[model samples]
Target: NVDEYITQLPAGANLALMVQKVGASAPAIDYHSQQMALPASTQKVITALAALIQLGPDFRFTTTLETKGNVENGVLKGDLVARFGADPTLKRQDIRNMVATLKKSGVNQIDGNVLIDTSIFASHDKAPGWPWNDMTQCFSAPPAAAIVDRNCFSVSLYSAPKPGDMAFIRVASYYPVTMFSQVRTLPRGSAEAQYCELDVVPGDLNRFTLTGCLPQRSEPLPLAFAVQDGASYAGAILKYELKQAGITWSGTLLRQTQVNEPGTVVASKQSAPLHDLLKIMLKKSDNMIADTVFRMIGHARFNVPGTWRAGSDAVRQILRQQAGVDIGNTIIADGSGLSRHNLIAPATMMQVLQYIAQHDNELNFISMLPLAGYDGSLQYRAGLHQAGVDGKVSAKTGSLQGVYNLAGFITTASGQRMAFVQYLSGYAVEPADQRNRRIPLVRFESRLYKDIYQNN
Candidate 1:
């Protein structure tokens, strides 16, 4: 039956499925439950749970703006420090607001450097299994203690008049980076396709090249590129914000991994609570937020600098203790599951869903998931509006190059709540940047849901 269902998929397609009542011991269906498969972003489910359990829903990440200088006659005497506490949601505006707070502190000039402390997490920029090619993509942005605007830079490209003219390019915000553009505008309605590409220069930290073509009269192309240097980027933004606030610094911007003595706090910002962050992470499948939260799990659990190993261990430990699942079989490379090396068994994931259904904070955890046909990543899922099943499923959706997985709680027609996990791997699809390749899987899952509701 399983083989026949997957016949339309790629010849190498592999599937694993498990379904059980919320508190039941035996599963109604357990096909290849022991077979491990890539979980893709479904791994965020585990990450979400571990973070909720370890850090609590009320926990908040904080970023502080401080200075060791003495302000006398509107002139500061020492260094200004931006101490980051791994708040992934920090934006350019937040830094600007921090500068506004500095203005309120009655200081104007700085005779010392603008230093950034990024030691809240380890110095590892990229995860182990992350693809090198994806490093330039905003989705593959690395986690950093001093994250500003998710460590991404947005650029706007506009076509020039007629053809053969240089395309006008604009970086959305100020950052300390050099941009070399080689893009040319193409003729209106020309056979040439629109394109925008950014290449980070190797060896040089703050240099990138933008090359691509845009048709004349085309709408502006807005693109966000991953930042290679996190601390430096933060420093650049802070410097710009300060300058705009009428503050002057005589020294160069610098980043340090060491935590300096707590300077006189000029200003600070606290992120939304953990529950709020989980909603965004799960809904958007935010890679940077998930990875940073994973590291935070490590910091909370062991009181040490966050690292992949520590975060992975902390997640396993929480699952073992809370969900009663033996995680020895799982291989968690990174929290966001961007890594191709991540693997999890269907049965194991179902165990987690089952635990969440009955845990003390069940409502808080489940509410964070993307609602089917309503919002989050599953807003457009198949069968979402199919009468009996529409809005019945609250789940997390996962997808990669050749993998798709869904895991969460479902309310049947008969009002029975169930935990389920579906994972498909090795599916052959045309290699394209577009995501239309997963339509087949979406249709199949839709039909599967109808069958399950009818049978039950």
Candidate 2:
């Protein structure tokens, strides 16, 4: 059957196939069982499983916004502070909501400068060995210890050229800019793409830079980005929103390691539970969120705080002990699949899927995957296949030039349940530029299922 399937496909590439089912027979196939390939966001499956077991299903990350100075009679004498326990759900509106919460908490006038305390995390939130190209691109925006809107801003590119002129670049967000244009006019070309580069130089906290341009907009604009700290970024925006809501503060923020300490608990806000947050992260293949949770697991398990080392090691432990996986050749440098150093065989991935399928506490595991045409990162992939298949498949998708992967559960029209993982490598003949998967190819895959569920 596999040979027949392979023969009927249009394009062929290096593929490693493995499958495990809970209720059916598995087919014999000659696919390499040990070949390593890009595991992609499917890496989240292991992360989620590890998280479920490490932190339990009810675990939640809380981001707290508090003031360090004293507030008396509509006058605050201390700096405004934000303490983040790495809550991935903290978004832009959530920042605004926090300001509202602070307003309702009374006395809004501040006298201290903004203070951002992101010391909650150890090690840079960014992966150690990720490509420099990724660092300069939007997809590779560094994860901040105290993140705001995923540490990403908006830049809209538009063209009104006299039917032939270049496009203009508009960088919008609370983030200040020093970006200047290099290409004053829009150049005739393919679709537009842009990268925003941001970074804080070592030992310099007050000054940072954002550099990049949009697809059609060729002017390279550099941004003069700075903040007292991560907390200040949140507080600054919150302050901005609060001003509109008729609130004013004069005190600046000061960074203090202890947010809930004496006189530091000025205000606090709650986020959605951990399970829901995990759903959002996995469904969207958010590497930053995954990295955050992985670190948290380390905090909970080994009593070691921060750093991908502890988190990734903890995840490996889960796969080894619970899922019967062999970690000999697997290299998981970061919880997020951003690391090219991470490696796993298709069989190992399928084993993970099979374990999730068989486990009693598996709902969260499968639900976190991007459903075909339904939600998360898969929303735009509904047309990946023939008419009915787009909305019919449910799987996690992974792509990192030279690496493309798909793994998760899929349900057929007949209600026949199946779980699979297919890894494609060495097919990235050319450096991928968003059109790799668009090239048609046939999938010669194999699957394994419970022998008792045969012929169902």
Candidate 3:
């Protein structure tokens, strides 16, 4: 019945299906397993797997803030500098603490522009595999170098009736532009703008513009993503925080500017272990972490530190040489899977699971995956499904508007193990509308998976 039903379904459902040939004598699903479309976040599985294969649990990446100036008599007399060393654990609080450290060390004042020495990383941190349109989006554009705040500033809009009331951007951290224009809160129920159009002017970083309206305001609020220098940003923030604490500074923020050159060590700090970084990254589907980890593979393994392309290319070597798994149609864009240029067939993913299942390093690979209904990106998702199967599935889940994907192992009621890979994309209409269609598809897959498990 299972095989007959699977074979009867239409193959053109904008879906990819593949089942492991492990334990079972033959394939269990009949959908087109080779179709290539958007895989969305499902790409994280590859990252987690590739990282585990190349790096051990103990590896760590470092981010340090330095300076060319000497601290003397309550003032730093030189340029405060920032040097990034591929640390994925660089959080907002970490940046603040760095500021505090610089103060305690007697550094004060930054009269110069924050210079970002992103030279260590290739000039392009933007994923070569991402679509051009994604550049304006927040999740898509993380900080480029040594200094980044809360990743990116985000504006949240809440509404009520009337024109005089105000809507604000709950900026995660401070930036060059401290103020924003009024965002219109549209009347009762018209479709709202999902995103605002913002731009960085040609060859300049200090200024910007917004060209779209909020939910209702006719004069769409004007906003900015000021050009920032990573090194300068770090020094400036540190100086600002020190000033708040009643400390004064006479120094300036400047870039080491030597891409690979270490100017001077102003402050040094140990990094959190790579395992801890990977755990948070895998669980949260974090992009920065993915990029950092992707880069770390090169630095840690090949000595080609920093940048997304180096890391991505390194992972590609592993997939092709060691595993013998061909992407066929998949693009290894950013290790984070945030790019539309990336693609993966369901069968290819299923093959990945099978290889991991048989390898001596299987447990390590499996451990990096977000446990079902537990930590990481799956934290909010594992709701309301029946206990045994729902709570038992330890997998990676990916979604981007209309695209939905799940690929990993599912342990059955009887404890028989099986690996599965399923992906869905394309639009019956709008991409958002197409996403609604996936809920039922997921349920069907769930039930079908359980049946195969119980019967086997």
Candidate 4:
């Protein structure tokens, strides 16, 4: 009954499963629990657990505007340093408000370079195993030290009235991106030329070009692109916002990797607490937040610039030292579970789940998970919507092209809490039955999970 869909799964498809209660003598359902599998976003729960174990609720993310200058009247004789804390929640509006705070701080002019400090993280923000095609997406945006609006921007494309004319693009002046439109517009309802596909070509320092074909339509097409250079983007926004705030600086914006401990603070802002951020991270499966938290864990632990390797190594140590849990040899490439290199077994996740459940009263993290047929990633999923399962089960979902995973607490009808993991991989259906591909998976869940609910 537990391995209901073993024969129904597609060729090469496999699964790892584990389900047990806290006081149980043994797991009710355990199959391939030792086998490693891609964890996808379910690894986020491990990251969250590690954060709660190491960094308490009091430690928060912060950004500050400091100066080493001597100010008299309306002029400051030294540089303005923007020390960044790699807060994923930092936004363009936050930058604007920070500049206003600076303006209100009595320094209207600066005589030195405005420094943007990005020393909290290593130079390479992206993991090597991340897919190449998702590079320009916001979900794949590099979680560098300097982040604004999650490192994403959007623009609209307008088609031309006359056929064969180039399409135009519209972007806000405050957005510091350099772009070119080589897009040709075809006549209304015209057939596109062979190989006349829409494409985006990215370049260095946030430069890109749009080359493709678009028909004369009434609606404008929108494009959201990720920032390639975080420091440049932060510096440009600081510069523009300074001008907007009626402040002037003599020197240009300079990028630095070090923060001055002796500098005087002009203005400072703190991000939302880790408690709330972790809630949002689990509920949304936010990649940027996961990566930032991952890096911050390493930063806080090792007292060095956080890197992928640092986070990966730090989590293993943190779990073992703090929670007495061993996640042996499981490749933790990134916290968000976006990298293809990340691996974890259902048994390893069960250990984390047991720890989290035992500590749930103090941590309150399980409350942050998505509820079945209610909220977060599980709101629309059909598998967990059966009679006793829907509205009773709450968990986190991990999904990729060929993988679907879940790990969370599912309460049985008798009021006992059951922790579960479904690590599904290599799920692909042949073209002939592709439309009904999800039927087998749904069948597997509806039948098996209900059995777990009623019997346990």
Candidate 5:
């Protein structure tokens, strides 16, 4: 059975598959389970479990807006501070709400600088092995202790009325950055062409640039991108909202560790509980949230500012002490698997799935996975429903270039709960071939599940 299964996989594929009945002492099926391979976004399964284990499901991140000076006659003499608690899902609306909260407090003006504090996490943003090109994309937005709108902005482009015209471009969100456009409109019926390209240069007047062409009659094009600095961006958003709310600040916006003077929180916001945030992070495969939570794990576990190394260390320790899966010395460069350097054995992933199943947080943990053919990233994977297992499989999906993976719980046809992990990496297919080549792996998984479910 193992040989037959191996023959069906992609050539030169590094594959690992492990499935075990819940509460069983041994795995029902295992192939190369001990071999480590790139787990891709499936790495999130580890991060999510670690976060829930470290920070209970009820944990919530908080952000506060405060000032040291008292409001007298609608004029304040001190600086306003925004303290970020590493809430990954924070949005512009939350900032606006905080601004409204301040407005309602009877003070409309700020006389000092709007200080932004993001010291809860280390200053280094990007993790090792993350591609430089991905840095500007929203999916790989840099993690920050205080991030707003996930530190992302959307740019929209519209075609001109006629050919040989400049394409209209604008940013959909407010940030402290600027954009320069060099996009032009091509004639109607022009062959398909690359319409837009984006670039970011930090610390420049025009920090971001959009350059490309749009064929005539082209529909609107929109792209979401990561910002250069989270705290600075948050400060800018607050300033824009403050001006809109008729509040004025006389000093410049500055990023710092904390307020120079003792300040009282005038307005504050609490994020949805960790359970809900995990749902968003796993379902959407949000790198920012995963990395943020990963860092928070370090902060919570070690009582220190979070970093990639610190967070990975905390995760390793938890898995060893609590789950009994000692992934000693395995490369866990970064959470969210954005780093290509991450590696985990199929057996290890299976162990985590099983541990979560029997652990006290099983219900909370299982509820967070993306259900096959149902919701989240798994909504579109119809192959998972093949062989009458439509809703039986609930797992996290991962992909990176030639890598594809899935790991989670599956209720077999006999109604027996099982924990499983499937990973494929190092395929020799070309980039274009990888997309089509991946379908066979998905199909193989469907067949495997069918055989296992029927036999069990």
Candidate 6:
């Protein structure tokens, strides 16, 4: 039955599938088990587990405010330093609150300049090998040390009613990014729709330009652009908040690679604990959290500014030393699996899955993944419910151009806990059958899960 289902797939498809009862040395089903394949986001499993082993499940990322000056008659004699940790969920308001906390200490004027410390990460904000086209998108925002507001900037384009009119742009006042729009509003039903009529040109320091044509529409079209310079963006925001609070301080925000001098603590913010963030990363496939934590793990293990190489090396060392799971010779360029160079064999991943199963009491991260037909990315996957395996299946889903993968644990109808890895690549379907798995992938997955739940 499984072979019949696979034969129905499009021509030239490659698959690596495996299913094993947790803790078993062998598997019940295996296909291309020894061949290496691209992991996509399923690689988050490696990063998250390595973090739990190295950083502990309760670890938290903190952004700190330390003062280097003393207040005399409402005038501070020294400077205030902001030391940032790469917490993906940090917000602009958090900066505002921390500045306010300093003002409440009856200090308003400062002679020295404010300093920003983002030494946790190096200058390479983005992981190597991220698709060039995706760099401008918010989901691919660079995992920089001084990140705030997810390092995402939003713009709205308003097209005039008359054709050939320039579109107007709107952006938040607090966000410090320069943007120019030359996009023209084209007549409705114009041939421009058939071509590449709209595009955003990104530049250094978060500068951008909108070019091409747009059909006149009633609503404003919204666009998101990634922050190219995290340090400047965060520095601008901090300066704005402090100025708004009626505080007279020193020169512009100064970038300090490291905070060596001692200062008293003012206010700080801590991110959600590691386990909580891992749930979001696995469920939503959040690249920012995964990559930051990926780099953070390196920082924890090696005590250095995190780099892609450090993350790659740290993960391998952590997994091998802590769990005895050896991922020899495989390339793990970045933690989020967004890199084009990542490769892992199904059998190698089995070792990781087996280790998680053996230590379930501590890891406790199984349910954090996407539950079939319940929540997260898999919630809309109706094929899972058709097989009566919706809530019974929980796994991390991985996707890239021409690739779809799944790795997680499932409870079978036989009441056995099993771990599976499904790697499908070079996938394509006929032009007319474009409605997703309704044509192929979904049907194959539904049938596969159904067979496992009922017969295995």
If scored against the real structure, what TM-score would every candidate get?
0.90, 0.75, 0.76, 0.95, 0.90, 0.96
Model 1, 1-456: lDDT tens digits are 445667646567788988898899999878898898899999999999899889888899999888886888888898888898889898889899999998888879888988888877885868788888888788997787878888877777777775787777687446666666677787766666634443344235656776767667758878667888888778878888898999998998888686446888889999999889988999889888899899999988998878888998999998998668777779988889998888889988988888788883664878888888888988878645553576788889888877878899788877888888989888776667246676667556766777666665
Candidate 6: 10-residue stretch with minimal lDDT? 430-439
lDDT by residue (1-456, candidate 4, tens digit) is: 765566656777889999999656478899898899999999899889888767776668888898887988888899899989999989888889889988898989998889999887875989868998888888899889999998899999999888899999998877899989999999876668555798888888889799989888899999998998999999999999999898898998988886347488778788888988988899989889888999899888888888888888899998898887888888899899999999989998998888888888998988899988888998877767853587778789999878988899999988999899999999999899888788777767777678889888
TM-score of 6: 0.96
The most accurate candidate by lDDT is: 4
Off by over 4 Å in 1: 158-167, 173-176, 184-203, 212-220, 360-363, 384-387, 430-436
Encode model 3's per-residue lDDT on 376-436: one tens digit a residue: 5554442314233555666777777556677777676567677877676652334555445
RMSD of each: 2.9, 5.9, 5.2, 1.9, 2.9, 1.7
- Comparing 2 and 3 on lDDT, the stronger one: 2
Clashing pairs in 1: none
Q: Tell me the tens digit of each residue's lDDT in model 6 across 352-415.
A: 8889889888789787889988898889775577778888888888898778888888899989
| lDDT to native, each model | 0.81, 0.62, 0.59, 0.87, 0.80, 0.86
What is residue 229's positional error in candidate 3, in angstroms? 7.2
What's the CA error at residue 61 for candidate 2, in Å? Answer: 2.6
Which ranges in model 4 have alpha carbons more than 4 Å from their true place? 187-196, 431-437
Q: Model 3 Cα RMSD, Å?
A: 5.2
Q: Which residue pairs overlap in candidate 4's backbone?
A: none
Shift of residue 72 alpha carbon in model 5, Å: 3.4
Comparing 1 and 6 on lDDT, the stronger one: 6
- State the lDDT of candidate 5 residue by residue for 117-234, as single tens digits: 7767874888888888888888888887868877877777778887667777677555667866666777765654653443444444327766667776647877777876777678
